[PDB]
Write a protein that binds this ligand. Structure first.
Ligand SMILES: CCC1=C(C)/C(=C/C2=NC(=C\c3[nH]c(/C=C4\NC(=O)[C@H](C)[C@H]4CC)c(C)c3CCC(=O)O)/C(CCC(=O)O)=C2C)NC1=O
Ligand SMILES: CCC1=C(C)/C(=C/C2=NC(=C\c3[nH]c(/C=C4\NC(=O)[C@H](C)[C@H]4CC)c(C)c3CCC(=O)O)/C(CCC(=O)O)=C2C)NC1=O
Ligand SMILES: CCC1=C(C)/C(=C/C2=NC(=C\c3[nH]c(/C=C4\NC(=O)[C@H](C)[C@H]4CC)c(C)c3CCC(=O)O)/C(CCC(=O)O)=C2C)NC1=O
Ligand SMILES: CCC1=C(C)/C(=C/C2=NC(=C\c3[nH]c(/C=C4\NC(=O)[C@H](C)[C@H]4CC)c(C)c3CCC(=O)O)/C(CCC(=O)O)=C2C)NC1=O
Ligand SMILES: CCC1=C(C)/C(=C/C2=NC(=C\c3[nH]c(/C=C4\NC(=O)[C@H](C)[C@H]4CC)c(C)c3CCC(=O)O)/C(CCC(=O)O)=C2C)NC1=O
Ligand SMILES: CCC1=C(C)/C(=C/C2=NC(=C\c3[nH]c(/C=C4\NC(=O)[C@H](C)[C@H]4CC)c(C)c3CCC(=O)O)/C(CCC(=O)O)=C2C)NC1=O
Ligand SMILES: CCC1=C(C)/C(=C/C2=NC(=C\c3[nH]c(/C=C4\NC(=O)[C@H](C)[C@H]4CC)c(C)c3CCC(=O)O)/C(CCC(=O)O)=C2C)NC1=O
Ligand SMILES: CCC1=C(C)/C(=C/C2=NC(=C\c3[nH]c(/C=C4\NC(=O)[C@H](C)[C@H]4CC)c(C)c3CCC(=O)O)/C(CCC(=O)O)=C2C)NC1=O
Ligand SMILES: CCC1=C(C)/C(=C/C2=NC(=C\c3[nH]c(/C=C4\NC(=O)[C@H](C)[C@H]4CC)c(C)c3CCC(=O)O)/C(CCC(=O)O)=C2C)NC1=O
Lengths: 50, 162, 58, 160, 162, 160, 160, 160, 162, 162, 162
């Protein structure tokens, strides 16, 4: 989702705990990663909508 | 994106300098304009629909063939795409005015837009005319002081497309 | 409102899947309130049957 | 800045700024003169702050300046003082921007990788930042002292 | 889902037998009713928004507490959820009428709806009243022959939701 | 069926049926008498169809009934003819449905895997279905013959 | 179109058209002459339909041409009747195509946004479309009026 | 509220509130008494606001209370005034909250579909919100008038 | 996409005109051949596997280097891709023949195909020869009257690729 | 989540009433403690890593078998998960203190937590010990009034576990 | 999943103990059987199709009703799903036999399988008998030594279904 390794200080710990607990699936993990501020910062803010 | 403060910080960081008297002057100027910018932003948000209403009305009055059969704004889909584009232009010009900088218009709007319209067949000159109409409508609502500053960013978009 | 906890079974009808696909057939998951209508519609339109709905939070 | 965060938040939701965000921008610009006063105060005492903070750092950790240390020599101690100057500049930038974005993106993201690559001890950075915090807040007024302390506290937490 | 035709096919396929005269008679019955089912579906579709208008108006006239502070339908959000649920019930009931089978109601409506409503606290009695209101409003438009058939699927929805 | 496919397409868009879909259902139901006549004709003559189709298949492919063949022996030949009967019944089902759907759920999805597990040569299946097509089409009127041949052609293409 | 929609449906599944899709194309091309006659009948009397439907619309909804209404004035009323002429032409296109795909492409995608941007009430649009439906099915026999009303009802539902 | 937005934003990134967010909360809680007295003065005079706003709305757009209008009759006019009362209450909630989230969850999300199912024209609502803005800003001080006017502006923009 | 009907409709729509005598003549022309089109489409659908087998055999006989070691169709993977591509060409040519229009061939087959095959290394001339082999095989099955119409779209594919 | 202001708003919205004198009294009470809450939150944010270090050090000092082999916090993975959980508790207690309400604790922390720890084998008693350790360290750091407020949400977490 | 070696490692890590004589004997035993396990896995993988065919034939000869109409394996789709499940069981039994552990059978096979079969309508007893048929067929090929080991995991699957 982020096109390269993300350092530990930027990884989202709450989704990861949710995922290894089985509360959410990989699809919901990917959704959490997409909806984070890191994604908006890297792949929405510097680009046009198209 | 960069706003005015970010731009000053950048121009002083790339040369390793602390802020000078000129930097603090620019920062005071932006903070002084802040209240006017906020008032204009609130007014435009309250009246975004109306601004698009009248801007599109007068653009299609000056260029009737756009909405008539054979024009690029002739079908409900293409007309809706056109007013959606005008919505983009108004919202991002308001962002740029509130920021005091034109960088958001560069990155989020103008980057590749001529390519997009060329591939779509959208007439760019008529889009510039729509932006000019939007300028005319917005300047009435925001008042002269805010009209000058907001017309700065409308003219930035018009110059970037033309 | 807030989260539902839904258990559903989605059988396969268009083909036979060579992968294990058990985790794609019977599963329990937490859905946000604002997503549950669309998720329930998708489960129904895939021919799946919803075992149970609970309201965890809220 | 504050304005940039409000704008990106509105834009990610394809909307104009709400009255609360405009109120936040209003409060930010109504405090601008105070922020510039504080930042200009920190700029005037650049050299005082850096030299005092270096003294406090080097008395608490003599081995850093002692032979075999990370900062031993005029060149390496000068590099140390230069890093402190970097971070004080970043603090002034954050003061004017009304938030710690300039600090986080010029001096926080990747700082651990930087200082692992440079073999600089990170507790040394942390308590050098605490030294700058004490020296700088000794100069500001109590109201300004709390505000500057917030940015120094954020930077100290960021290094750890 | 299965319609009447697929219902007969499944019944004769599980037994492993070819079609009998009984199967052919059931198929002939469905083909006989098909034209009136299509007319009823068209009439309902042409009037769907109007039916939801009147049915929700009746449901809130009989129970004004539903849309007042403290009611399950008190907000614009919950009111919209209520009317959307009514609209989905109408469209799926029309599907089941055109198919001649209640299987689509089981598969795509009642599949998980009872549990969702119980968890949310949606008044089951009031939902049944709303479905009854749709039944009444639709019967006026479709005519007695079509209304008797539409009542089967409205009653199925009310029974499953009860 | 035609009705089920129309409903599923319309529900994929959360809409009522379009005029085209309603016309499609009207044309389907207006044809039910002809379809039921065809299905009646195919059901009454099922045993002649199966016998003549199996005879044609084994005449053209003696290897299936020769020693070492998949259909060698009384029991295997009986299972072969029973499969042919299955597919004739499925063709009648699809005829009354107005589409190849029932054929698809009952006898096409996973068919290649099942005949793989049973050492049944799929070309033999295609050729047996072609034999059934010829026999059945020889019985019906030409207008119905083309429609029935379409379902047999779908089956033979699905087995290939 | 019917053929267009069948091809698109078969393409999404990466398959040739089924016997049912071929059958419904057959039925659509069997009905071509009747559809063309209906379209000619609606075309030859377009001015009468538009004028009469405008009269019924403005009688039932006089607020539109009352002061403050969107149809108020000579030019706005002319543009009103021009919109009605548009939708009549799209109905003729739909009749010849056998489906509402042309009507979707030309006058259903984005209608709510367009008429919002035009201060056009959508209940008024629905009432005008019903007026055209009555006037147009008046000039037709029952069998033709059913399908023409189906297209007009599609328009009304899309605008509603 | 401002507090809820700040906490939610910090929680999304899994972090404590930054000095900017704490500054925002400080500025919000420092203005709590002003917002409270504004909400007090709107609440104590709600009957005057609703009456004068209804008068202005029906004067500017009499077609609503003209025969055939959506608000024709004392019962429908009472329902209109009850809706205006709702929105004044939501504006008071938004004033005390520091943001427009109570207004959003209670009376904006789903307002389009609700008012379409009621056949209420959205331009009428927008003009009624302008009438309420004028009447309410009439009886507050200039800064208080601006503060209420921002929320009324948001409500008008959301209704359109 | 477009077919004959949709083509005529778009032609008259871009002018904002109601259907004229010539338009109705073209529509009748399409309706007249619709029956033959359906018959031919069913013929190819029935015999597609045989057509691909025979056309691929003819092509790989005429150019044995295509499937000898070092050929572009030399691996089970690349051989499968080659026969799969031929099946795609046949299927889309059948769609175009049924629609009475070559627009689908442009928009869904031919657009960006030379660039794709050039980046892959697939020899375009051999692909054209495969399409010609498909034409030859298909013509015998469909019958001359349908074969001319089918060959229109086959030659359209060959010319667009050439 | 909801805060004190939002809770009062929801109460009066379900009641359908405008704000009363008691509602304004509650809002004044919350606004009065805003600066105290903000100071406590900032002090905690500065000291969060410290607080976690002393709290975990004391917890593992009293229960040393938790991090010796056979204990629940024995591995780098398990120890890291333990300190991560303690940091979560501190951060969400701070959120609740700022909001003046415990709803975020239920919605985002406690719902499901007890059976999560019960299924994993995480001891509830030791977790409560760690939460009390954080409570006393935080209270020493934040002063008397801030500690009195903070203990409410720490106790809420503890009692929501049991 | 878990290996026999990983099993010993965990049993000694939770004790905080180095390997002793007992652990080294267990590791020696697994290392000694490793070559036999690899031979059996190779033979099974080589003959997986033949085992599935023989076992399915034996199962459907003992229970012919399963593949006649009304049986759970009456359709090409359900017959394919049946043989697919048998392939699952064989492949995972081979994984577990190679691992010398039944952990993978719990984690990736039996976890929610019984309830999935219950909801689908699958006869659990007949699936168990198919597993038994795989047991005998596989034991015929792999040989006397590997048959008992492989039947250990077949019995594990049979009991986990029971
Ligand atoms: C922000 C809301 C939130 C909470 C509260 C939360 C708690 C939480 N802790 C977990 C595991 C754990 N939690 C602990 C902590 C325990 N070890 C004991 O010694 C201590 C007494 C005690 C902590 C003080 C441990 C050791 C695990 C790992 C258990 C395992 O890996 O099997 C898990 C399961 C998945 C994982 O490893 O992350 C959750 C969901 N997660 C969340 O997203
Ligand atoms: C946020 C920055 C941004 C912009 C501005 C943008 C423009 C944009 N305009 C588009 C289409 C369009 N845009 C227009 C507008 C034009 N037609 C008339 O001639 C007018 C003169 C003129 C508008 C004033 C039209 C008619 C289309 C439809 C084109 C088509 O479908 O062929 C599309 C293709 C997607 C769609 O159909 O909605 C984009 C991406 N994209 C972006 O990411
Ligand atoms: C708290 C948020 C909320 C709102 C806003 C809300 C509005 C609302 N207004 C209603 C009625 C109504 N509302 C209006 C108001 C309109 N009349 C004119 O056109 C004006 C432009 C406009 C008012 C300014 C009218 C006329 C009715 C009566 C409709 C009827 O009975 O046919 C109804 C149906 C229940 C009833 O009959 O009283 C609702 C749900 N409900 C909510 O839960
Ligand atoms: C296509 C089959 C299908 C349906 C119909 C369906 C209905 C449905 N209604 C819901 C909520 C709701 N449904 C209603 C409607 C009821 N409450 C009112 O009092 C009325 C008496 C009554 C309607 C006549 C309301 C008010 C809510 C909001 C409940 C809440 O927010 O707490 C929800 C929860 C999620 C959401 O609204 O986004 C669903 C899934 N779901 C489905 O998969
Ligand atoms: C309605 C859906 C359906 C179908 C179609 C179906 C086919 C089917 N045919 C079978 C047997 C068989 N089927 C055949 C047929 C072949 N013999 C020649 O090779 C020919 C090419 C070809 C027939 C034309 C043969 C020879 C057997 C016996 C194979 C054996 O048991 O060893 C079996 C194994 C169980 C049994 O003996 O009944 C199935 C499942 N099952 C279904 O549930
Ligand atoms: C082919 C698809 C298509 C359609 C349908 C279409 C409609 C359309 N109608 C327009 C104006 C208009 N349309 C109407 C019609 C309304 N008057 C009353 O309110 C009635 C409820 C309603 C008609 C029954 C009116 C009054 C105007 C004038 C708006 C103005 O001048 O402010 C305009 C703006 C440009 C112009 O004046 O020509 C468009 C684009 N355009 C298209 O490309
Ligand atoms: C290395 C990857 C690769 C393989 C394997 C491959 C095989 C291959 N075998 C072919 C023909 C053939 N292959 C066979 C082999 C069959 N005869 C009996 O049935 C046996 C069961 C079986 C062989 C044991 C036969 C008889 C032909 C001739 C087909 C014909 O003349 O119609 C062809 C068609 C073109 C040609 O003949 O040159 C290919 C491409 N191609 C590849 O790129
Ligand atoms: C099997 C995986 C595992 C590991 C490795 C582990 C390490 C570990 N070392 C600890 C303490 C410690 N560990 C060290 C070791 C450091 N001192 C020097 O700096 C050296 C560079 C370095 C060792 C070479 C020291 C000095 C302490 C005492 C800290 C204190 O007293 O506060 C603790 C705290 C609790 C306790 O002492 O029992 C843990 C959990 N725990 C585990 O579950
Ligand atoms: C890797 C571990 C694993 C297993 C074991 C597993 C079993 C499994 N079997 C299924 C269906 C099925 N399974 C069977 C097989 C059974 N019915 C017959 O009567 C026999 C008695 C018996 C086999 C010997 C059948 C017939 C179905 C079709 C049920 C249906 O859709 O109607 C399904 C539903 C999805 C599908 O249809 O493909 C699953 C998940 N899935 C997994 O991921």
């Amino acid at each position: 989702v982020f096109e390269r390794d993300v350092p530990d200080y930027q990884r989202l710990s709450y989704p990861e705990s949710r995922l290894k607990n089985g509360e959410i699936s990989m699809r919901e993990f990917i959704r959490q990663l997409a909806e984070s501020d890191l994604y908006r910062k890297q792949f929405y803010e510097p680009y046009p909508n198209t | 994106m960069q706003d005015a403060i970010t731009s000053v910080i950048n121009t002083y960081d790339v040369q390793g300098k602390y802020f000078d008297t000129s930097a603090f002057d620019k920062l005071k100027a932006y903070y002084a304009t802040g209240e006017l910018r906020v008032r204009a932003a609130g007014t435009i948000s309250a009246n975004a629909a109306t601004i698009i209403k009248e801007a599109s009305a007068k653009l299609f009055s000056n260029q009737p063939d756009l909405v008539r059969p054979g024009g690029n704004a002739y079908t409900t889909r293409r007309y809706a795409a056109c007013v959606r584009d005008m919505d983009y232009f108004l919202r991002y010009a308001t962002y740029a005015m509130l920021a005091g900088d034109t960088s958001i218009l560069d990155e989020r709007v103008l980057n590749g837009l001529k390519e997009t319209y060329n591939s779509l067949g959208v007439p760019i000159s008529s889009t510039v005319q729509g932006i000019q109409a939007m300028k005319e409508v917005t300047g009435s609502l925001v008042g002269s002081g805010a009209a000058k500053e907001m017309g700065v960013y409308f003219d930035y978009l018009s110059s970037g497309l033309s | 409102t807030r989260l539902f906890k839904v258990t559903a079974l989605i059988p396969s009808y268009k083909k036979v899947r060579g992968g294990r696909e058990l985790q794609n057939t019977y599963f329990t998951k937490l859905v946000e309130y604002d997503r549950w209508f669309a998720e329930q519609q998708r489960i129904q339109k895939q021919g799946g049957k919803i075992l149970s709905v609970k309201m965890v939070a809220g | 800045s504050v304005v940039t965060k409000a704008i990106v938040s509105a834009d990610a939701e394809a909307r104009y700024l709400s009255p609360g965000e405009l109120d936040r921008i209003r409060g930010f610009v109504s405090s601008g003169e105070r922020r510039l006063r504080v930042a200009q105060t920190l700029t005037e005492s650049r050299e005082r702050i850096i030299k005092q903070a270096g003294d406090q750092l080097f008395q608490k950790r003599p081995d850093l300046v002692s032979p075999g240390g990370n900062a031993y020599g005029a060149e390496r101690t000068a590099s140390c003082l230069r890093d402190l100057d970097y971070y004080l500049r970043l603090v002034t930038f954050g003061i004017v921007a009304g938030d710690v974005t300039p600090i986080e993106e010029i001096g926080v993201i990747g700082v651990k990788e930087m200082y692992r690559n440079l073999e600089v001890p990170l507790p040394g950075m942390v308590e050098a930042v605490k030294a700058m915090k004490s020296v700088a807040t000794g100069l500001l007024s109590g109201d300004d002292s709390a505000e500057v302390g917030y940015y120094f506290d954020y930077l100290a937490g960021a290094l750890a």
